[PDB]
Design a binder for these strands. Structure first.
Ligand SMILES: Nc1nc2c(ncn2[C@H]2C[C@H](O)[C@@H](COP(=O)(O)NP(=O)(O)OP(=O)(O)O)O2)c(=O)[nH]1
Ligand SMILES: [Mn+2]
Ligand SMILES: [Mn+2]
Length: 539
DNA sequence: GACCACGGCCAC
DNA sequence: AAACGTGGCCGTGGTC
């Protein structure tokens, strides 16, 4: 391109280089812009930011986040990554999108800006006529990128002193468990090395190996295997306890306090918008979509996510979301009636499984029931279901028979979906988001049936992700007007932060927006709570 | 120091 | 482990 002096004209495509992938932590090393066969390279990138009216180009959200960090309202606009991702969600990285649609991802801002210009022109051309993907682009993904930029720049408050103290309490229990393990094994070794554990459990001790690992064929030490040996030998029980605590300490308790940002005082994740095959978001650096919740220690970790002084967290989570979606997608009159009758299939499976009244279904029982309901739904084998439910193969098999018999329109939908996937090569959501599933016609059964399970899961999970994204796009302006903040999305949940005097109003409003986002054949229902911390707000 | 594969496991 | 699906991060073990 012909080098032109900064600033660029309105509507130019930007390119930028970060010192590191995380925008909230990155030094802006270079800034450039391309338009009309000219490239503009900034002499000092931080100052040059002030000249742009929007971030338009590859990874626009990231630059917008860094501008917000610097106090600049630079919203993300067009991003060829989002076009590629809607065309095919295996388009996940600039490296790949460039290597597919006519360019090369380098480490120079001017080139990245020129690349952004050429990739947009191309991908926008490929989407000419794809009016459903163009709707999703204009009405969901492009506006959503602005929402995520704000969430990423806002962050969440963390009770650091609390987690530091918890680290010590957990450490003392870890050393106790290790001591009991070393004693049972008769000698010390590295519990964290599954190779060494394998030799202790299955060679030194006489324990039987239930299963083997995929790539290398070692005898597995997975929880599922160890659960199979739970009473086979006590050491197993302590191993499982040691695993839980080191997992939570090494992944959450210890890393998270060290990630608080100097200027904000808060913790900042990244919401990756072109990372999943189904249309879901993902979260990284750190992942705040897999913060513990299930166990008593996990609940203690979640209590560390707290509201700024004078504010409250509002947590909203859709009810039985993919089951309602399935009702709408399949048109099963029976499943639809379940939700018009306001029943709850998780608590009912729970009461089935645990032989207890729906009044006696604690959160652990529901989460166990969730896994059964979605496991069975998405093709789980009777054999595993017997293992999980600790119940004979004949029973587990009739569980699956009952499940499907209750909702016959479902299996008709599954086979319609798969037939469509074979014919067109892709499956699609309610709003037309696509996943290409080429292995539906594979000649190896195992490969083909795996593709089948991925293929007919995507319309259900991807529709739910579509609804949530749309809700976020609708809800966000309403929150800014009430002086509230959107902090986190966890697939079918949102965490907000609101002034204490507005929290009831924000909660009421957010629940209405989310439930009425896009009426289906069944009502969407949202559970909402309010609390000083993430855990209190979900109750 | 940078990467990577693997097994393993947290969440939805 | 396994004919549930979708992610990202851990420590180990390893290379360059
Ligand atoms: N295939 C599969 N999908 C799952 C699993 N866990 C979650 N999902 C998918 C399917 C779920 O619909 C969705 C949201 O997960 P939740 O909010 O934790 N559960 P839900 O909204 O259903 O019930 P309620 O909110 O009343 O507790 O994530 C799983 O083990 N397997
Ligand atoms: Mn839910
Ligand atoms: Mn949820």
């Amino acid at each position: 391109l012909e080098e032109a002096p900064w600033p660029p004209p309105e509507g130019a495509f930007v390119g930028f280089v970060l010192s590191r992938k995380e925008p909230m932590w990155a030094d802006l090393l270079a800034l450039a812009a391309a338009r009309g066969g000219r490239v503009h390279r900034a002499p000092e990138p931080y100052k040059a930011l002030r000249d742009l009216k929007e971030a338009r180009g590859l990874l626009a959200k990231d630059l917008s986040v860094l501008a917000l960090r610097e106090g600049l309202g630079l919203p993300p606009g067009d991003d060829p990554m989002l076009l590629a991702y809607l065309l095919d969600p295996s388009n996940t990285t600039p490296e790949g999108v460039a290597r597919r649609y006519g360019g090369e991802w380098t480490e120079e801002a001017g080139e990245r800006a020129a690349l952004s210009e050429r990739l947009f022109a191309n991908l926008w051309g490929r989407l000419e006529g794809e009016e459903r993907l163009l709707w999703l682009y204009r009405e969901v993904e492009r506006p959503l990128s602005a929402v995520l930029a704000h969430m990423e720049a806002t962050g969440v408050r963390l009770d650091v002193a609390y987690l530091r103290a918890l680290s010590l309490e957990v450490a003392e229990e870890i050393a106790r468990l290790e001591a009991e393990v070393f004693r049972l094994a008769g000698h010390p070794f590295n519990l964290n090395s599954r190779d060494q554990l394998e030799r202790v459990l299955f060679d030194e001790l006489g324990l039987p190996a239930i299963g083997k690992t995929e790539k290398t064929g070692k005898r597995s030490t997975s929880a599922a295997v160890l659960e199979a040996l739970r009473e086979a030998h006590p050491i197993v029980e302590k191993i499982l306890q040691y695993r839980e605590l080191t997992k939570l300490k090494s992944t959450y308790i210890d890393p998270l306090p060290d990630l608080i940002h100097p200027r904000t005082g808060r913790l900042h994740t990244r919401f990756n918008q072109t990372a999943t095959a189904t249309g879901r978001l993902s979260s990284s650096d750190p992942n705040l979509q897999n913060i513990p919740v299930r166990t008593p220690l996990g609940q203690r970790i979640r209590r560390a996510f707290i509201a700024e002084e004078g504010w409250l967290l509002v947590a909203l989570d859709y009810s039985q979301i993919e089951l309602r979606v399935l009702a709408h997608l399949s048109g099963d009159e029976n499943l639809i009636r379940v939700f018009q009758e306001g029943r709850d299939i998780h608590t009912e499976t729970a009461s089935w499984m645990f032989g207890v009244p729906r009044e006696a279904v604690d959160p652990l029982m529901r989460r166990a029931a969730k896994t059964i309901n979605f496991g069975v739904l998405y093709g789980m084998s009777a054999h595993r279901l017997s293992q999980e439910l600790a119940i004979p193969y004949e029973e587990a098999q009739a569980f699956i028979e009952r499940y499907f018999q209750s909702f016959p329109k479902v299996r008709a939908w599954i086979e319609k979906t798969l037939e469509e996937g074979r014919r067109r090569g892709y499956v699609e959501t309610l709003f037309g988001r696509r996943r290409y599933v080429p292995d539906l016609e594979a000649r190896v059964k195992s490969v083909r049936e795996a593709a089948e399970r991925m293929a007919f899961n995507m319309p259900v999970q991807g529709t739910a992700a579509d609804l949530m994204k749309l809700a976020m796009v609708k809800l966000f302006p309403r929150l800014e007007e009430m002086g509230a903040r959107m902090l986190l999305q966890v697939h079918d949940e949102l965490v907000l932060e609101a002034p204490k005097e507005r929290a009831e109003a924000v909660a009421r409003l957010a629940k209405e927006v989310m439930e009425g986002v896009y009426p289906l054949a069944v009502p969407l229902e949202v559970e909402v709570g309010i609390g000083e911390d993430w855990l209190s707000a979900k109750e």
